PDB file of C-alpha atoms and ligand atoms in Angstrom:
ATOM      1  CA  UNK A   1     115.831  70.483 107.187  1.00  0.00           C
ATOM      2  CA  UNK A   2     115.710  71.679 110.511  1.00  0.00           C
ATOM      3  CA  UNK A   3     113.017  74.304 111.943  1.00  0.00           C
ATOM      4  CA  UNK A   4     115.333  77.048 111.952  1.00  0.00           C
ATOM      5  CA  UNK A   5     116.087  76.473 108.387  1.00  0.00           C
ATOM      6  CA  UNK A   6     112.539  75.796 107.539  1.00  0.00           C
ATOM      7  CA  UNK A   7     111.592  79.254 108.780  1.00  0.00           C
ATOM      8  CA  UNK A   8     114.746  81.130 107.303  1.00  0.00           C
ATOM      9  CA  UNK A   9     113.550  79.767 104.058  1.00  0.00           C
ATOM     10  CA  UNK A  10     110.234  81.330 104.305  1.00  0.00           C
ATOM     11  CA  UNK A  11     111.688  84.491 105.012  1.00  0.00           C
ATOM     12  CA  UNK A  12     114.357  84.003 102.113  1.00  0.00           C
ATOM     13  CA  UNK A  13     111.164  83.210  99.734  1.00  0.00           C
ATOM     14  CA  UNK A  14     109.380  86.227 100.992  1.00  0.00           C
ATOM     15  CA  UNK A  15     112.365  88.744 100.628  1.00  0.00           C
ATOM     16  CA  UNK A  16     112.790  87.628  96.892  1.00  0.00           C
ATOM     17  CA  UNK A  17     109.107  87.864  96.266  1.00  0.00           C
ATOM     18  CA  UNK A  18     109.491  91.866  97.539  1.00  0.00           C
ATOM     19  CA  UNK A  19     112.284  92.180  95.184  1.00  0.00           C
ATOM     20  CA  UNK A  20     110.554  90.522  92.158  1.00  0.00           C
ATOM     21  CA  UNK A  21     107.467  92.779  92.823  1.00  0.00           C
ATOM     22  CA  UNK A  22     109.663  95.824  92.751  1.00  0.00           C
ATOM     23  CA  UNK A  23     111.429  94.639  89.733  1.00  0.00           C
ATOM     24  CA  UNK A  24     108.299  94.046  87.813  1.00  0.00           C
ATOM     25  CA  UNK A  25     107.102  97.523  88.680  1.00  0.00           C
ATOM     26  CA  UNK A  26     110.399  98.976  87.355  1.00  0.00           C
ATOM     27  CA  UNK A  27     110.174  97.114  83.983  1.00  0.00           C
ATOM     28  CA  UNK A  28     106.227  97.661  83.821  1.00  0.00           C
ATOM     29  CA  UNK A  29     106.831 101.486  83.969  1.00  0.00           C
ATOM     30  CA  UNK A  30     108.819 101.322  80.501  1.00  0.00           C
ATOM     31  CA  UNK A  31     106.201  99.046  78.809  1.00  0.00           C
ATOM     32  CA  UNK A  32     103.428 101.388  80.049  1.00  0.00           C
ATOM     33  CA  UNK A  33     105.548 104.320  78.506  1.00  0.00           C
ATOM     34  CA  UNK A  34     106.483 102.828  75.231  1.00  0.00           C
ATOM     35  CA  UNK A  35     104.120  99.932  74.265  1.00  0.00           C
ATOM     36  CA  UNK A  36     101.325  99.225  76.840  1.00  0.00           C
ATOM     37  CA  UNK A  37      99.590  97.207  74.131  1.00  0.00           C
ATOM     38  CA  UNK A  38     101.069  94.185  75.640  1.00  0.00           C
ATOM     39  CA  UNK A  39      99.267  94.764  78.894  1.00  0.00           C
ATOM     40  CA  UNK A  40      95.895  94.029  77.341  1.00  0.00           C
ATOM     41  CA  UNK A  41      93.971  91.175  78.427  1.00  0.00           C
ATOM     42  CA  UNK A  42      90.792  89.397  76.845  1.00  0.00           C
TER      43      UNK A  42
ATOM     44  CA  UNK B   1      84.840 101.605  65.942  1.00  0.00           C
ATOM     45  CA  UNK B   2      84.366 104.227  68.941  1.00  0.00           C
ATOM     46  CA  UNK B   3      83.517 107.599  69.267  1.00  0.00           C
ATOM     47  CA  UNK B   4      85.093 108.235  72.727  1.00  0.00           C
ATOM     48  CA  UNK B   5      88.000 106.331  74.386  1.00  0.00           C
ATOM     49  CA  UNK B   6      87.785 106.730  78.365  1.00  0.00           C
ATOM     50  CA  UNK B   7      90.662 105.216  80.626  1.00  0.00           C
ATOM     51  CA  UNK B   8      89.221 104.167  84.072  1.00  0.00           C
ATOM     52  CA  UNK B   9      91.327 102.752  86.716  1.00  0.00           C
ATOM     53  CA  UNK B  10      90.385 100.376  89.645  1.00  0.00           C
ATOM     54  CA  UNK B  11      92.160 101.013  93.147  1.00  0.00           C
ATOM     55  CA  UNK B  12      91.710  99.454  96.485  1.00  0.00           C
ATOM     56  CA  UNK B  13      93.046  96.698  98.998  1.00  0.00           C
ATOM     57  CA  UNK B  14      94.075  93.570  97.876  1.00  0.00           C
ATOM     58  CA  UNK B  15      91.291  90.939  97.756  1.00  0.00           C
ATOM     59  CA  UNK B  16      88.396  93.356  97.556  1.00  0.00           C
ATOM     60  CA  UNK B  17      87.293  92.221  94.199  1.00  0.00           C
ATOM     61  CA  UNK B  18      88.926  94.618  91.568  1.00  0.00           C
ATOM     62  CA  UNK B  19      89.919  91.843  89.060  1.00  0.00           C
ATOM     63  CA  UNK B  20      86.421  90.528  89.400  1.00  0.00           C
ATOM     64  CA  UNK B  21      84.596  93.744  88.631  1.00  0.00           C
ATOM     65  CA  UNK B  22      86.934  93.946  85.651  1.00  0.00           C
ATOM     66  CA  UNK B  23      86.060  90.452  84.470  1.00  0.00           C
ATOM     67  CA  UNK B  24      82.534  90.882  85.290  1.00  0.00           C
ATOM     68  CA  UNK B  25      82.058  93.992  83.110  1.00  0.00           C
ATOM     69  CA  UNK B  26      84.352  93.322  80.365  1.00  0.00           C
ATOM     70  CA  UNK B  27      83.536  89.191  79.656  1.00  0.00           C
ATOM     71  CA  UNK B  28      80.565  88.712  81.787  1.00  0.00           C
ATOM     72  CA  UNK B  29      82.708  86.287  84.112  1.00  0.00           C
ATOM     73  CA  UNK B  30      83.444  85.710  87.559  1.00  0.00           C
ATOM     74  CA  UNK B  31      85.832  83.713  89.421  1.00  0.00           C
ATOM     75  CA  UNK B  32      85.564  82.586  93.092  1.00  0.00           C
ATOM     76  CA  UNK B  33      89.262  81.507  92.840  1.00  0.00           C
ATOM     77  CA  UNK B  34      91.082  84.327  91.158  1.00  0.00           C
ATOM     78  CA  UNK B  35      94.495  84.773  92.254  1.00  0.00           C
ATOM     79  CA  UNK B  36      96.224  88.198  93.199  1.00  0.00           C
ATOM     80  CA  UNK B  37      97.058  90.215  90.130  1.00  0.00           C
ATOM     81  CA  UNK B  38     100.660  90.379  88.808  1.00  0.00           C
ATOM     82  CA  UNK B  39     101.833  93.558  87.181  1.00  0.00           C
ATOM     83  CA  UNK B  40      99.473  95.615  85.435  1.00  0.00           C
ATOM     84  CA  UNK B  41      96.726  95.045  82.730  1.00  0.00           C
ATOM     85  CA  UNK B  42      93.750  96.471  81.308  1.00  0.00           C
ATOM     86  CA  UNK B  43      90.846  95.272  79.399  1.00  0.00           C
ATOM     87  CA  UNK B  44      88.054  97.310  76.875  1.00  0.00           C
ATOM     88  CA  UNK B  45      84.545  97.125  76.824  1.00  0.00           C
ATOM     89  CA  UNK B  46      82.428  99.192  74.262  1.00  0.00           C
ATOM     90  CA  UNK B  47      78.840 100.539  75.512  1.00  0.00           C
ATOM     91  CA  UNK B  48      76.317 103.078  74.415  1.00  0.00           C
ATOM     92  CA  UNK B  49      75.758 106.357  75.881  1.00  0.00           C
ATOM     93  CA  UNK B  50      73.433 108.958  74.736  1.00  0.00           C
ATOM     94  CA  UNK B  51      73.782 107.492  71.265  1.00  0.00           C
ATOM     95  CA  UNK B  52      77.674 107.548  71.294  1.00  0.00           C
ATOM     96  CA  UNK B  53      79.730 104.430  71.242  1.00  0.00           C
ATOM     97  CA  UNK B  54      82.028 104.593  74.334  1.00  0.00           C
ATOM     98  CA  UNK B  55      85.197 102.571  74.499  1.00  0.00           C
ATOM     99  CA  UNK B  56      85.884 101.851  78.138  1.00  0.00           C
ATOM    100  CA  UNK B  57      89.612 100.950  78.951  1.00  0.00           C
ATOM    101  CA  UNK B  58      89.706  99.548  82.603  1.00  0.00           C
ATOM    102  CA  UNK B  59      93.026  99.478  84.153  1.00  0.00           C
ATOM    103  CA  UNK B  60      93.716  96.683  86.865  1.00  0.00           C
ATOM    104  CA  UNK B  61      96.727  95.937  89.306  1.00  0.00           C
ATOM    105  CA  UNK B  62      97.377  94.526  92.726  1.00  0.00           C
ATOM    106  CA  UNK B  63      96.154  96.694  95.717  1.00  0.00           C
ATOM    107  CA  UNK B  64      99.517  96.767  97.365  1.00  0.00           C
ATOM    108  CA  UNK B  65      99.449  99.077 100.229  1.00  0.00           C
ATOM    109  CA  UNK B  66     102.710 100.902  99.050  1.00  0.00           C
ATOM    110  CA  UNK B  67     103.624 103.664  96.610  1.00  0.00           C
ATOM    111  CA  UNK B  68     104.721 102.262  93.214  1.00  0.00           C
ATOM    112  CA  UNK B  69     106.972 102.824  90.556  1.00  0.00           C
ATOM    113  CA  UNK B  70     103.718 102.442  88.161  1.00  0.00           C
ATOM    114  CA  UNK B  71     101.558 104.962  90.173  1.00  0.00           C
ATOM    115  CA  UNK B  72     102.191 107.884  87.995  1.00  0.00           C
ATOM    116  CA  UNK B  73     101.713 105.886  84.527  1.00  0.00           C
ATOM    117  CA  UNK B  74      98.814 104.194  86.167  1.00  0.00           C
ATOM    118  CA  UNK B  75      96.790 107.564  86.699  1.00  0.00           C
ATOM    119  CA  UNK B  76      98.026 109.135  83.670  1.00  0.00           C
ATOM    120  CA  UNK B  77      95.272 110.229  81.316  1.00  0.00           C
ATOM    121  CA  UNK B  78      92.539 108.646  83.509  1.00  0.00           C
ATOM    122  CA  UNK B  79      89.229 110.090  83.350  1.00  0.00           C
ATOM    123  CA  UNK B  80      87.444 108.013  85.964  1.00  0.00           C
ATOM    124  CA  UNK B  81      88.723 105.646  89.014  1.00  0.00           C
ATOM    125  CA  UNK B  82      86.576 103.131  91.117  1.00  0.00           C
ATOM    126  CA  UNK B  83      87.795 103.150  94.534  1.00  0.00           C
ATOM    127  CA  UNK B  84      86.776  99.639  95.893  1.00  0.00           C
ATOM    128  CA  UNK B  85      86.468  98.175  99.417  1.00  0.00           C
ATOM    129  CA  UNK B  86      85.132  94.956 100.807  1.00  0.00           C
ATOM    130  CA  UNK B  87      81.875  95.654 102.841  1.00  0.00           C
ATOM    131  CA  UNK B  88      82.635  92.618 104.747  1.00  0.00           C
ATOM    132  CA  UNK B  89      86.269  93.924 105.970  1.00  0.00           C
ATOM    133  CA  UNK B  90      86.190  97.233 107.894  1.00  0.00           C
ATOM    134  CA  UNK B  91      89.810  97.383 107.430  1.00  0.00           C
ATOM    135  CA  UNK B  92      89.720  97.963 103.415  1.00  0.00           C
ATOM    136  CA  UNK B  93      87.248 100.667 104.009  1.00  0.00           C
ATOM    137  CA  UNK B  94      89.666 102.501 106.656  1.00  0.00           C
ATOM    138  CA  UNK B  95      92.239 102.381 103.653  1.00  0.00           C
ATOM    139  CA  UNK B  96      89.939 104.202 101.383  1.00  0.00           C
ATOM    140  CA  UNK B  97      91.243 107.372 102.583  1.00  0.00           C
ATOM    141  CA  UNK B  98      95.079 106.247 101.963  1.00  0.00           C
ATOM    142  CA  UNK B  99      93.796 105.310  98.379  1.00  0.00           C
ATOM    143  CA  UNK B 100      92.142 108.379  97.892  1.00  0.00           C
ATOM    144  CA  UNK B 101      95.231 110.396  99.104  1.00  0.00           C
ATOM    145  CA  UNK B 102      97.261 108.678  96.333  1.00  0.00           C
ATOM    146  CA  UNK B 103      94.757 109.507  93.865  1.00  0.00           C
ATOM    147  CA  UNK B 104      94.690 112.968  94.722  1.00  0.00           C
ATOM    148  CA  UNK B 105      98.405 113.024  94.304  1.00  0.00           C
ATOM    149  CA  UNK B 106      98.875 111.749  90.905  1.00  0.00           C
ATOM    150  CA  UNK B 107      95.394 111.821  89.157  1.00  0.00           C
ATOM    151  CA  UNK B 108      94.027 114.592  87.021  1.00  0.00           C
ATOM    152  CA  UNK B 109      92.272 117.286  89.110  1.00  0.00           C
ATOM    153  CA  UNK B 110      88.672 116.548  87.257  1.00  0.00           C
ATOM    154  CA  UNK B 111      88.837 112.793  87.525  1.00  0.00           C
ATOM    155  CA  UNK B 112      85.555 111.142  88.264  1.00  0.00           C
ATOM    156  CA  UNK B 113      85.771 108.866  91.285  1.00  0.00           C
ATOM    157  CA  UNK B 114      83.285 106.329  92.392  1.00  0.00           C
ATOM    158  CA  UNK B 115      83.336 104.571  95.671  1.00  0.00           C
ATOM    159  CA  UNK B 116      82.616 101.007  95.550  1.00  0.00           C
ATOM    160  CA  UNK B 117      81.581  98.874  98.269  1.00  0.00           C
ATOM    161  CA  UNK B 118      81.918  95.394  96.790  1.00  0.00           C
ATOM    162  CA  UNK B 119      80.737  92.016  97.959  1.00  0.00           C
ATOM    163  CA  UNK B 120      77.325  93.243  99.032  1.00  0.00           C
ATOM    164  CA  UNK B 121      76.149  89.301  98.686  1.00  0.00           C
ATOM    165  CA  UNK B 122      77.879  88.751 101.979  1.00  0.00           C
ATOM    166  CA  UNK B 123      75.545  91.456 103.799  1.00  0.00           C
ATOM    167  CA  UNK B 124      75.207  88.942 106.631  1.00  0.00           C
ATOM    168  CA  UNK B 125      78.893  89.675 107.430  1.00  0.00           C
ATOM    169  CA  UNK B 126      78.679  93.399 106.748  1.00  0.00           C
ATOM    170  CA  UNK B 127      81.126  95.307 108.544  1.00  0.00           C
ATOM    171  CA  UNK B 128      80.896  98.765 106.783  1.00  0.00           C
ATOM    172  CA  UNK B 129      77.428 100.565 107.105  1.00  0.00           C
ATOM    173  CA  UNK B 130      76.002 101.726 103.989  1.00  0.00           C
ATOM    174  CA  UNK B 131      75.226 105.327 105.502  1.00  0.00           C
ATOM    175  CA  UNK B 132      78.629 105.778 106.584  1.00  0.00           C
ATOM    176  CA  UNK B 133      80.114 104.904 103.263  1.00  0.00           C
ATOM    177  CA  UNK B 134      77.647 107.247 101.405  1.00  0.00           C
ATOM    178  CA  UNK B 135      78.397 110.178 103.821  1.00  0.00           C
ATOM    179  CA  UNK B 136      82.077 109.982 103.220  1.00  0.00           C
ATOM    180  CA  UNK B 137      81.696 109.799  99.344  1.00  0.00           C
ATOM    181  CA  UNK B 138      79.299 112.987  99.411  1.00  0.00           C
ATOM    182  CA  UNK B 139      81.875 114.733 101.466  1.00  0.00           C
ATOM    183  CA  UNK B 140      84.530 113.976  99.153  1.00  0.00           C
ATOM    184  CA  UNK B 141      82.791 114.504  96.094  1.00  0.00           C
ATOM    185  CA  UNK B 142      82.715 110.959  95.214  1.00  0.00           C
ATOM    186  CA  UNK B 143      79.848 108.809  93.602  1.00  0.00           C
ATOM    187  CA  UNK B 144      78.757 105.667  95.498  1.00  0.00           C
ATOM    188  CA  UNK B 145      77.414 102.389  95.140  1.00  0.00           C
ATOM    189  CA  UNK B 146      77.351  98.774  96.553  1.00  0.00           C
ATOM    190  CA  UNK B 147      78.175  95.982  94.330  1.00  0.00           C
ATOM    191  CA  UNK B 148      78.691  92.046  94.135  1.00  0.00           C
ATOM    192  CA  UNK B 149      80.948  90.851  91.472  1.00  0.00           C
ATOM    193  CA  UNK B 150      79.897  87.503  92.765  1.00  0.00           C
ATOM    194  CA  UNK B 151      76.141  87.737  91.763  1.00  0.00           C
ATOM    195  CA  UNK B 152      76.612  90.703  89.468  1.00  0.00           C
ATOM    196  CA  UNK B 153      74.342  93.096  91.544  1.00  0.00           C
ATOM    197  CA  UNK B 154      75.023  96.616  90.460  1.00  0.00           C
ATOM    198  CA  UNK B 155      78.231  95.880  88.584  1.00  0.00           C
ATOM    199  CA  UNK B 156      76.812  97.067  85.062  1.00  0.00           C
ATOM    200  CA  UNK B 157      75.270 100.084  86.659  1.00  0.00           C
ATOM    201  CA  UNK B 158      78.397 100.950  88.507  1.00  0.00           C
ATOM    202  CA  UNK B 159      80.337 101.388  85.323  1.00  0.00           C
ATOM    203  CA  UNK B 160      77.493 102.917  83.483  1.00  0.00           C
ATOM    204  CA  UNK B 161      77.057 105.164  86.075  1.00  0.00           C
ATOM    205  CA  UNK B 162      80.837 106.700  85.999  1.00  0.00           C
ATOM    206  CA  UNK B 163      81.030 106.494  82.328  1.00  0.00           C
ATOM    207  CA  UNK B 164      77.796 108.236  82.127  1.00  0.00           C
ATOM    208  CA  UNK B 165      79.195 110.988  84.687  1.00  0.00           C
ATOM    209  CA  UNK B 166      82.400 111.455  82.502  1.00  0.00           C
ATOM    210  CA  UNK B 167      80.447 111.737  79.479  1.00  0.00           C
TER     211      UNK B 167
HETATM  212  N1  GTP C 201      81.652  86.992  98.072  1.00  0.00           N
HETATM  213  C1  GTP C 201      82.316  87.652  97.129  1.00  0.00           C
HETATM  214  N2  GTP C 201      83.541  87.522  96.847  1.00  0.00           N
HETATM  215  C2  GTP C 201      84.065  88.299  95.850  1.00  0.00           C
HETATM  216  C3  GTP C 201      83.341  89.183  95.278  1.00  0.00           C
HETATM  217  N3  GTP C 201      84.376  89.833  94.454  1.00  0.00           N
HETATM  218  C4  GTP C 201      85.359  89.197  94.041  1.00  0.00           C
HETATM  219  N4  GTP C 201      85.318  88.148  95.252  1.00  0.00           N
HETATM  220  C5  GTP C 201      86.288  87.166  95.520  1.00  0.00           C
HETATM  221  O1  GTP C 201      87.369  87.825  96.437  1.00  0.00           O
HETATM  222  C6  GTP C 201      88.421  87.324  96.178  1.00  0.00           C
HETATM  223  C7  GTP C 201      89.506  88.237  95.675  1.00  0.00           C
HETATM  224  O2  GTP C 201      88.934  88.827  94.605  1.00  0.00           O
HETATM  225  P1  GTP C 201      89.563  89.744  93.436  1.00  0.00           P
HETATM  226  O3  GTP C 201      88.646  90.254  92.316  1.00  0.00           O
HETATM  227  O4  GTP C 201      90.951  88.878  92.747  1.00  0.00           O
HETATM  228  O5  GTP C 201      90.531  90.993  94.244  1.00  0.00           O
HETATM  229  P2  GTP C 201      91.433  92.068  93.857  1.00  0.00           P
HETATM  230  O6  GTP C 201      90.862  93.278  94.482  1.00  0.00           O
HETATM  231  O7  GTP C 201      92.096  92.055  92.398  1.00  0.00           O
HETATM  232  O8  GTP C 201      92.886  91.692  94.656  1.00  0.00           O
HETATM  233  P3  GTP C 201      94.273  92.071  94.275  1.00  0.00           P
HETATM  234  O9  GTP C 201      94.493  91.694  92.748  1.00  0.00           O
HETATM  235  O10 GTP C 201      95.158  91.141  94.942  1.00  0.00           O
HETATM  236  O11 GTP C 201      94.434  93.483  94.454  1.00  0.00           O
HETATM  237  C8  GTP C 201      88.536  86.137  95.323  1.00  0.00           C
HETATM  238  O12 GTP C 201      88.356  85.093  95.858  1.00  0.00           O
HETATM  239  C9  GTP C 201      86.936  86.624  94.578  1.00  0.00           C
HETATM  240  O13 GTP C 201      86.580  85.557  93.902  1.00  0.00           O
HETATM  241  C10 GTP C 201      82.395  89.486  95.554  1.00  0.00           C
HETATM  242  O14 GTP C 201      81.470  90.271  95.177  1.00  0.00           O
HETATM  243  N5  GTP C 201      81.657  88.673  96.493  1.00  0.00           N
HETATM  244 MG1   MG C 202      93.238  91.596  90.850  1.00  0.00          MG
END
């Protein structure tokens, strides 16, 4: 793996991370407005 | 079980200590290696107030400097909020205004707000003068206190105080 490829991979993983966080937020809204009990921690 | 249920949310920059304030209050636990929070969670703790059993429902989520799809639901029904910053990182204090604005745009108008300067154990690295934060709080009608989730200083007091103001 070349240097350019490694830097591109970091950028790619960071972009994916943003998309995953956005998706989690979208899905969580539904949960919070239906059955938020699953969000409890102990 | 309880007489009153009060929803209180934690807000503030990533890394200021929100999750450890939650763990200290609800489980008497601190984790120096805690990782950034994923999703949204809440934990409960029952305390005594004026002879009444109060069930505090504390909500937590990562402090992402961005509007989120969960924002509306997060503040919904909340009667209290802890706006947290890191006394050792002036940047987290500068962002307090941004968090307060977000709160004013989604939370109930009568929500009780307490400005919390966490990580007081790092006083040797203080970057936010106590007097300045207190001035900002009183100016915006916010309670104020400095805490250390690490050594536990004022953590119980912070929650007890805000819950007492709510009730
Ligand atoms: N020195 C010191 N460190 C603390 C204190 N409270 C939390 N920390 C540490 O600061 C780091 C961040 O703490 P967290 O509680 O995960 O911060 P957070 O606000 O929940 O961060 P996000 O979930 O990313 O929004 C961790 O390494 C904690 O152990 C404190 O009072 N003093
Ligand atoms: Mg957290």
